[PDB]
Symmetry: C7
Subunit: 73 residues, 7 copies
Amino acid sequence: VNVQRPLDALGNSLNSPVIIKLKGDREFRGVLKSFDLHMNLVLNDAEELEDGEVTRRLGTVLIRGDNIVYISP
Amino acid sequence: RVNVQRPLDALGNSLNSPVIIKLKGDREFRGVLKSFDLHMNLVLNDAEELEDGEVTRRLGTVLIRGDNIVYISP
Amino acid sequence: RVNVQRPLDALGNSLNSPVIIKLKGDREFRGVLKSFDLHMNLVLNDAEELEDGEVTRRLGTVLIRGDNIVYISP
Amino acid sequence: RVNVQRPLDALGNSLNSPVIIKLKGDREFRGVLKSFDLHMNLVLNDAEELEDGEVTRRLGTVLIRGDNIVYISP
Amino acid sequence: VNVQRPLDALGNSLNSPVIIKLKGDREFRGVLKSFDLHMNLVLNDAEELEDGEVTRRLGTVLIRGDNIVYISP
Amino acid sequence: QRPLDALGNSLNSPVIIKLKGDREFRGVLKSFDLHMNLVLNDAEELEDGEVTRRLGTVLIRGDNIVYISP
Amino acid sequence: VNVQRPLDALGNSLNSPVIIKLKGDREFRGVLKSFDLHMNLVLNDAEELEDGEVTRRLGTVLIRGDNIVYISP
């Protein structure tokens, strides 16, 4: 990560498990497969959670960047 | 399967098949994806609308504005 | 019927036809689509505002700002 | 009354005439439309605010920011 | 007030008392001193209101245009 | 014709920043840009007019600002 | 700091501990690694707090700027 490119953190995490925190306390965990500059992204083998609890399991999911709070490899 | 710099390709890969569209505020649609643009505006055919996870109605065609979408799953 | 990369063609296909509009905050309109732009600003004629299957207001013509739209169903 | 691709021309058609403006949070204003821009910022003269079919406030001239507007009608 | 320039209503109101209604129902009243195309504006001898009663007095205040619902001279 | 000059006039002097959701900051204005992103020093955060947090320096995003009062 | 460049406050804290406050009252503490003009930023050894106590450890997190209220560098 260059001191001027935060998104290089996403690049560094391609093909690896990440945690996505959305607004409203929704959370996703899965393998990062693709992303654009808007932080739209695709995860494979995804889990949607609540209270540290799986509420849905998704083989692949496209998440719109505008609803993201943070991404944590 | 999806180019690493094109997440919207996930939409293209699923054209004319059933998808799940989670919208803000616990609304969701399930129906056949017919079209989409780079804003994630999209058209479904033969879609059920759900609210709180209960079906409220079925719509023959529906255009969803992308700014309301949270995620999409095939 | 709709080009796969042009979802707004669903609106083009429905000029002079009845449509349903669902707004953020859940307000709903039914009326005849007369005009629209790429922002989804639109004009309806013979418009009805609904709330429980009940028409709460009729307007002969109305201009709806696209930014507040959830979806549009022709 | 409006080009099928120019919904905002509905505003031009209402210039110098009474209109009804519905805002977010259910506020309603009625007055004479004096000017407007592509953002739907607009000026009314002799404006009144309505709640439950009644004037809760007489505003005279008022400039309404477009971003808060739900719909406009004659 | 020219038909394609709503901002002229502000120009007409310079140095005159105005009422500014904000998102969230907060209201401000004061003398309009300055504004820009974004509707950022400066009032002098401002008062903040909650149900027609002054809740707060300010001598000078710059209000961000993005939070404004209406301005009424 | 330029309200942003009100900020210029107040550099290096105490200001009050009111944010959305009722949060409020007081501190010395050090820097700002056209977006109203701004830096304060000796910043105090207030609630009910009470000071609940002290920050030697804070960068506040403009999009959250309701008003600024010198 | 340049009176016309508030983000120079971020530059000044590259590789230093910072405090990030988000909308809806989330707060993070960590080492600032990079940031862009939108205030998207990356923290290392990040922690999530609540009422002054740590409630969550992350080893690297990318935070979207649109959700930031303030940063205390």
